[PDB]
Amino acid sequence: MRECISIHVGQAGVQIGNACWELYCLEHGIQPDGQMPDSFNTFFSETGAGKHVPRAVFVDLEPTVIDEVRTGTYRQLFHPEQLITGKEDAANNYARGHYTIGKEIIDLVLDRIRKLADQCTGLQGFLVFHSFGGGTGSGFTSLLMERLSVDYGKKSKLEFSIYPAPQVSTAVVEPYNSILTTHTTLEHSDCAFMVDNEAIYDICRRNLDIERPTYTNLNRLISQIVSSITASLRFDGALNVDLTEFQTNLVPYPRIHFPLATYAPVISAEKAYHEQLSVAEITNACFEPANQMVKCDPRHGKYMACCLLYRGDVVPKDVNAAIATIKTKRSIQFVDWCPTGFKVGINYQPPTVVPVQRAVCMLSNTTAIAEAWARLDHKFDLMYAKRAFVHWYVGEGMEEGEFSEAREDMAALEKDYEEVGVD
Amino acid sequence: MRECISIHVGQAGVQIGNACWELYCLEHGIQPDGQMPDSFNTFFSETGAGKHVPRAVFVDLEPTVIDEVRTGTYRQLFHPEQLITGKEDAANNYARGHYTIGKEIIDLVLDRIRKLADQCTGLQGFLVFHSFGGGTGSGFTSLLMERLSVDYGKKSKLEFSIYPAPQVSTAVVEPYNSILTTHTTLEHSDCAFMVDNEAIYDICRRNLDIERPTYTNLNRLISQIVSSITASLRFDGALNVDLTEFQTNLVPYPRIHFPLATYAPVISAEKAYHEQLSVAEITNACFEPANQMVKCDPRHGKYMACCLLYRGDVVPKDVNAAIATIKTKRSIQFVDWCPTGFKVGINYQPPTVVPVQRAVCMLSNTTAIAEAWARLDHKFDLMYAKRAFVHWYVGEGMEEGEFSEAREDMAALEKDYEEVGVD
Amino acid sequence: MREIVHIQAGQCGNQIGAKFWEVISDEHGIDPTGSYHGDSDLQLERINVYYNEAAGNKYVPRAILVDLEPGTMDSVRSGPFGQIFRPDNFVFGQSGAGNNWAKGHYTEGAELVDSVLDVVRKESESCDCLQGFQLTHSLGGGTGSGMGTLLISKIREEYPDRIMNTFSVVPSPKVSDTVVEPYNATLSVHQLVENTDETYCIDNEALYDICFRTLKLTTPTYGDLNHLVSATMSGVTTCLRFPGQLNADLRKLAVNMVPFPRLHFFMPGFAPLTSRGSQQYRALTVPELTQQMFDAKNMMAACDPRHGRYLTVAAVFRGRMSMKEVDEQMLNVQNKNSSYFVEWIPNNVKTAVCDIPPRGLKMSATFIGNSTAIQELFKRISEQFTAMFRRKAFLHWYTGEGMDEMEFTEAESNMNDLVSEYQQYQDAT
Ligand SMILES: Nc1nc2c(ncn2[C@@H]2O[C@H](COP(=O)(O)CP(=O)(O)OP(=O)(O)O)[C@@H](O)[C@H]2O)c(=O)[nH]1
Numbered sequence A, B: 001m002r003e004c005i006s007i008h009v010g011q012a013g014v015q016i017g018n019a020c021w022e023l024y025c026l027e028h029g030i031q032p033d034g035q036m037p038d039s040f041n042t043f044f045s046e047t048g049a050g051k052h053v054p055r056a057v058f059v060d061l062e063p064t065v066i067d068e069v070r071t072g073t074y075r076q077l078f079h080p081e082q083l084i085t086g087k088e089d090a091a092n093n094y095a096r097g098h099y100t101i102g103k104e105i106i107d108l109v110l111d112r113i114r115k116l117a118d119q120c121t122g123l124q125g126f127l128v129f130h131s132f133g134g135g136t137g138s139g140f141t142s143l144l145m146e147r148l149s150v151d152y153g154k155k156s157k158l159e160f161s162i163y164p165a166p167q168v169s170t171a172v173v174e175p176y177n178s179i180l181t182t183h184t185t186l187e188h189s190d191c192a193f194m195v196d197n198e199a200i201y202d203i204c205r206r207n208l209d210i211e212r213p214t215y216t217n218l219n220r221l222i223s224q225i226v227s228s229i230t231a232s233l234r235f236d237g238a239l240n241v242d243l244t245e246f247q248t249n250l251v252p253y254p255r256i257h258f259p260l261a262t263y264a265p266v267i268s269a270e271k272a273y274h275e276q277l278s279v280a281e282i283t284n285a286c287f288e289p290a291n292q293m294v295k296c297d298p299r300h301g302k303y304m305a306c307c308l309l310y311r312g313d314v315v316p317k318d319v320n321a322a323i324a325t326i327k328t329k330r331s332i333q334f335v336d337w338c339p340t341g342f343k344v345g346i347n348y349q350p351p352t353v354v355p356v357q358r359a360v361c362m363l364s365n366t367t368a369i370a371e372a373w374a375r376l377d378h379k380f381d382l383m384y385a386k387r388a389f390v391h392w393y394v395g396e397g398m399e400e401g402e403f404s405e406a407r408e409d410m411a412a413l414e415k416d417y418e419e420v421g422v423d
Numbered sequence C: 001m002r003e004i005v006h007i008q009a010g011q012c013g014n015q016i017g018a019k020f021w022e023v024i025s026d027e028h029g030i031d032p033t034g035s036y037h038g039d040s041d042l043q044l045e046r047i048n049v050y051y052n053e054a055a056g057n058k059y060v061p062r063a064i065l066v067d068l069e070p071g072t073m074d075s076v077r078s079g080p081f082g083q084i085f086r087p088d089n090f091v092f093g094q095s096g097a098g099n100n101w102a103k104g105h106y107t108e109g110a111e112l113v114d115s116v117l118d119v120v121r122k123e124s125e126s127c128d129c130l131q132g133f134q135l136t137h138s139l140g141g142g143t144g145s146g147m148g149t150l151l152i153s154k155i156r157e158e159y160p161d162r163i164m165n166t167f168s169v170v171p172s173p174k175v176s177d178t179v180v181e182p183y184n185a186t187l188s189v190h191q192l193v194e195n196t197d198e199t200y201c202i203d204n205e206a207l208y209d210i211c212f213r214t215l216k217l218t219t220p221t222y223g224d225l226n227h228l229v230s231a232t233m234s235g236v237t238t239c240l241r242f243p244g245q246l247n248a249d250l251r252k253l254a255v256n257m258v259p260f261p262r263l264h265f266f267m268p269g270f271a272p273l274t275s276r277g278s279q280q281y282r283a284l285t286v287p288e289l290t291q292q293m294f295d296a297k298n299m300m301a302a303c304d305p306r307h308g309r310y311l312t313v314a315a316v317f318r319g320r321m322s323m324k325e326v327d328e329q330m331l332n333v334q335n336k337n338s339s340y341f342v343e344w345i346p347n348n349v350k351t352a353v354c355d356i357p358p359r360g361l362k363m364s365a366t367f368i369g370n371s372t373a374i375q376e377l378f379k380r381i382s383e384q385f386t387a388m389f390r391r392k393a394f395l396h397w398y399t400g401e402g403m404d405e406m407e408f409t410e411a412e413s414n415m416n417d418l419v420s421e422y423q424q425y426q427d428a429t
């Protein structure tokens, strides 16, 4: 009766969704053919025959990666009216994804939403797997979110996004993407989510015993996070926290909606022993700086709000002693005027494995993330100091002052976390 | 006890009838030899031996396409006194079909009607499959309908016709056909039916996964419509709507008798899954502009009356909620002074297949069709501004002012829908 | 006669009633189906007060189950004692309150309230004589906060004489399971102080403590967390359902205890409590049941009676027992803790003796306490309110529902009006 649809924008989001719906089919026992040999209306719908289809929309301006789903192993799962392709990519040009090509096939993707919104009645959240690296994953992202608040307005819109890395950075105009996309995702998204590529590597290198990771394995870490956020809807625990509450819990002021995800425990197969993984053991590893997936030191700021989504085998009194430890420390410290800073969620379902006992997803809306914007503002100034690459965005119809209008917009964003940090 | 005979005029109507009676034999299990290994008197009659013959009359002025029935696979089905051929065609000349050649073999075809009207006693409608493209399908059409209102007058006369396309237009004097035939089919036909070739292509291209259709496949779409209009006579549903009621339901004023047909759901074989095709799902696809078979946008006018002929597996309360949605929308809107604008018909017979669960035929007498006449009036003015091709119609005995008499006749036709549109 | 209609709300309070009606099932021999299997005929003599005897050897729980999402109603009906209820009475919404008080009280509270108030009317018409209404919910969630408090103001508009008791859990002192637990407390404080006749107040942390201090448990489940309140609620009306040497009911407990209508916020107490094997090595008699009550640790609300002053004391016993073994114990303990009480009441110990024990041990006692210790918890809660209010955070949700600061401020002032009055009689002696 309760639903939560998903949209995938750009090439980086599709390869996230290739591992996500790989995991969801293994959750409810679904085959790649939509077949299984109760309450799962959030991510699936039933046909007239005994087949289930995903509530997913795959958009791309280049026809490459969607053919990898249209010819891959997960081929028969998807409705061919969902698989939407373009012809010419934005090709790491935000003005092409926002003005040139994305304005043409915008009619088809938005029409597929209401075709999914017929059978949905408990519409409780949206999923937009979009990166800020590629132009298609960013230029279409701004055009998509404008119509939905015109469409729904009151319904929830969540973005499990990918943060551009401060050191290991692939493309060139990746600093140009973030400042331009700021005005959309601060005025439409109810709670955006930042994940950096860079912190994943040492988690793969040290904690997962494989120094040289693959992008197939980078998606496996985030796919476990997205499932355990939905662990209250898809199942039944003693304390089920639905997605309406998170945007009401984690948001003290309606502009501040940038937490970070933290999955724990992250172990290897050989290190599955030499440990016991009690509920007090693993939550201290959550607040370890080298276990999070965002390159931000949590002891460089203060926590505004914290959330903990447990699964597996959990007794709350045993967690009650675990939370009592973290308030009674000193290197871990909160925003002082928020003394009630925990949101606990327990599900009695084990964390499934993709080819352990319990697992924790930590969601901490903190002030440690605010330094990451300043590391990216420093990138954007010098490339705009030369007026470099202006003839591509202006070459694809964009105002020069639209950079400058969004330039001060980050300063009003940055002064928020600075103001909340002091008493 | 109830009957409905059929007449086929011109070459385009015969190839429609080649697929129609192909379908009817597959309905009641009839072989091509008139053989089957109850109540079907509407389209058939029984011989002394166990053979059934179609109530069809095939007229043509050229001997070509009738030999394709006289030598084809469906050869033994037809009475050779029904198969009527001419010698010289009208050859895309309306004045030849109306004055020159059609005046000679008019005696034979009209004599075959009363030979069929002996065994008929519940005569409830006529079927004239005539196109407006060819001269034989239009010139004979005017001469045929004049005698029948002299013959019967009170009996029903229906025309499942083919509308000439605004862009993909084959012949040259196709604008000359429509203005001349207007005075007959507005003064004899109880309810004419327009079907454009152009909207069929994208239905074949997108919705049927074959970008390059064949005329054998164009006839398959209309043949499903003609069957489900007769789905109340030939069978038994809980709400059987007979053909006397449609001309009384769909006609608010006796000149306005131009609805349009809409078959739905139109799916492909591979897209038979990834769907469930509930009775509320498919009726929204009926009012989709790209699913109808007439190139007219339904959101450019208002609906005067609507009809829905269901078959397959239908519960009316489940349809009662579906009709309640369409009145409670805004982009779909009626003529306001007609608040009772639905005619529902349910048959408990599945839509048969020609080499699914349910099917919908939608008949919507609307004001969106009135722009199609203005697109064809614009064609007819300039070709008459030069006085082009006057020496063929006057070359075959026709008044010049007979164009001009029918010229203002479209203006009195066009001002009807404009007057009904306002309150 | 004097039948009682049961209303639930929230998500915590439903699982308590999912255990509480199991307690009433074996306190009346009621099977999981709905039929009868008891042998003692004292059950059938007063069976009507918590059960409608339906047609054909049936018994249905006179209870109204209310949620705002179909999850918890599915969990009750699938697990134990779900088919015992009436399927007509599973009256629940589809949205979920979103852990917002204003969603449960203004927007979504107005929807399902009409479906409930007929069911309240249908039971109150069907009851021969009506005693009072009882409510089990949360003060931390959304559905337990707004939806339950919206009902009681409509019921006080209906019935002036009928009593009302809420077994509402206090928001937690130190652990913070709810992020907005002041915003679910303070907006719920104002409804409770107006038109609730008596109000039960249970801290979360002491319930963890009593399950760990006396019993010494390792893995306490909510089937054993919330079970202590289920025996507690049964001990309130256990003198009603059975005869005694000194009977009692919900009106006798009200007028004895509550000295002024703004001071009616109570604390429980239960005895005896043992371990699984450490159960015989103790003289489990009246003086052991005497001194097990009056200590600080037995209170399910975490408060020190040493840091406060009592006003009145009720005590409900179960099982057959003598009197001077009780009465002198119920007299002398006022003299050893002499300065902890208040001056202006002689013999503030209300005694109640039923003649039916629990299904189990031979004798049992239920303590109902009233003291000035609870107001010191609210000064933390008023601090927890103002800490999230001196920056004026979390307002745009309530602004999106529509509410001025004065409704927050006067309820905080009315919370301080509770502060100004429990301190007033504490300062007096
Ligand atoms: N002693 C118990 N406390 C509980 C239990 N479940 C939740 N809680 C507490 O109750 C509070 C949450 O309230 P609820 O469980 O009633 C949530 P509710 O349906 O009322 O509203 P929503 O937030 O809209 O879901 C919070 O303080 C929890 O710590 C339980 O089984 N026992």
Ligand SMILES: Nc1nc2c(ncn2[C@@H]2O[C@H](COP(=O)(O)OP(=O)(O)OP(=O)(O)O)[C@@H](O)[C@H]2O)c(=O)[nH]1
Pocket: A009, A010, A011, A012, A013, A015, A016, A062, A089, A090, A091, A092, A093, A131, A132, A133, A134, A135, A136, A137, A138, A162, A164, A170, A197, A215, A216, A218, A219
């Ligand atoms: N999360 C994630 N990010 C990836 C992966 N592979 C590449 N990326 C990042 O994705 C960004 C590139 O975005 P893309 O989605 O591939 O490009 P696009 O949006 O389709 O736009 P164009 O390809 O420029 O037309 C870079 O920052 C890459 O580091 C992956 O497997 N997972």
Ligand SMILES: Nc1nc2c(ncn2[C@@H]2O[C@H](COP(=O)(O)OP(=O)(O)OP(=O)(O)O)[C@@H](O)[C@H]2O)c(=O)[nH]1
Pocket: B009, B010, B011, B012, B013, B015, B016, B062, B089, B090, B091, B092, B093, B131, B132, B133, B134, B135, B136, B137, B138, B162, B164, B170, B197, B215, B216, B218, B219
């Ligand atoms: N419905 C339908 N129309 C067709 C088909 N093939 C051609 N047409 C249309 O039919 C029209 C031509 O009419 P015809 O019936 O072939 O010609 P006719 O009436 O016999 O007259 P002449 O051939 O000129 O002597 C044109 O508008 C064609 O586009 C077909 O398979 N189905």
Ligand SMILES: [Mg+2]
Pocket: A010, A011, A012, A134, A136
């Ligand atoms: Mg790409």
Ligand SMILES: [Mg+2]
Pocket: B010, B011, B012, B134, B136
């Ligand atoms: Mg022809």
Ligand SMILES: [Mg+2]
Pocket: C010, C011, C012, C141, C142, C143
């Ligand atoms: Mg709840």
